[PDB]
Amino acid sequence: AKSEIGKYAPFFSLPNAKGEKITRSSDAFKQKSLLINFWASWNDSISQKQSNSELREIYKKYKKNKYIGMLGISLDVDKQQWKDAIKRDTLDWEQVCDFGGLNSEVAKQYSIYKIPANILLSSDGKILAKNLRGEELKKKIENIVEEA
Amino acid sequence: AKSEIGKYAPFFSLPNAKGEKITRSSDAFKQKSLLINFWASWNDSISQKQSNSELREIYKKYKKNKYIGMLGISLDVDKQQWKDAIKRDTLDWEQVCDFGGLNSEVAKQYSIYKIPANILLSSDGKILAKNLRGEELKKKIENIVEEA
């Protein structure tokens, strides 16, 4: 219930590849809406590949945008496997992982029942949508950008 | 934690495809050691393909053995996807799933940090081994069914 649409996002604070803790209020994301994608290198499935294709297109279009940010949260347990995937899969938006895996607190807090998954937050942290894909995702991001 | 080697396995009761509730003491498993494997149909990974091959060979060899049984626990949320994988991959040992997904009771009770995963229990329910693969898996099952 804590991650249902319209609720405020549960807190997280998770380390990036350099070990810096990132939150929804880190400088890259403050005052922006935030698209958070969940994945793991141990699930390089067709669905994950599709999500990645879609997310690479969003990042390419919106990487230097005032209104929208992107964060990848991995459920990997192995740091080298995680970093290797970031490189191979060109996951060039910010990436975090605490190596807890399915036992990672963030996975429980966000009630992740499968991966890939995603969640979209307003700049005030409100949960706008979950598990958006395809044209619907495209349109929601376009709308956020238009709302300025 | 509750799933360390030497501890009694956490309780579970999960429905098979026909809706029968299966536990470690169900008729097929009573007084046998039990190999439980955790998976999901959506986890189309190399580890999952290799795991399925390994498990199919254990099943082929030991399906009528009086000292070992096998149980697949899926972390699927979609029943048709689950059943379709069972058929495609001939997962013909007992299969259960309650559609709760990654954050459900049994995944948390067993501290599953990624899938695929497995656990081996003695006939009294104590945890003997975790995440057995390859020749190590074969040798452990051989050792389990050996008569004194």
Looking up residue B115, the CATH number of its domain turns out to be 3.40.30.10
The whole-angstrom separation of Cα B78 and Cα A4 is 20
Task: Tell me which residue range forms the domain holding B26.
Answer: 1-148
- Resolution stated for this PDB structure, in Å: 1.7
Helix (H) / strand (E) containing A127:
strand A127-130
Half-sphere exposure of A134 (CA within 13 A, CB side): 2
B77 closest CB neighbour out of A75, A76, A113: A113
- Identity at A126, one-letter amino acid code: K
Which chain B residues have a beta carbon less than 8 Å from that of A115? 102
Residues of A with CB under 8 A from a CB of B: 40, 42-47, 75-77, 100-103, 107-108, 111-115
Rounded distance, CA A21 to CA A27, Å? 11
Testing the interface with A: which of B74, B102, B110 to mutate, by most A Cβ within 10 A?
B102
In angstroms, the first-to-last Cα distance of chain B is 32
Is there a cis peptide before residue B116, judged by omega within 30 degrees of 0?
Answer: yes
Structure token digits, residue B39: 């998976």
Chain B nearest-CA distance from A27, in A, is 31
Residues on chain A touching B77 (C-beta within 8 angstroms):
113-114
Domain total in chain B: 1
Between the CA of residue B17 and those of A32, B63, B82, B97, B100, what are the distances in Å? Answer: 45, 19, 9, 8, 14
| Cα distances (Å, whole numbers) of residue A59 to A14, A28, A40 | 21, 14, 19
How far, CA to CA in Å, does A110 sit from each of A102, A117, B92?
Answer: 12, 10, 34
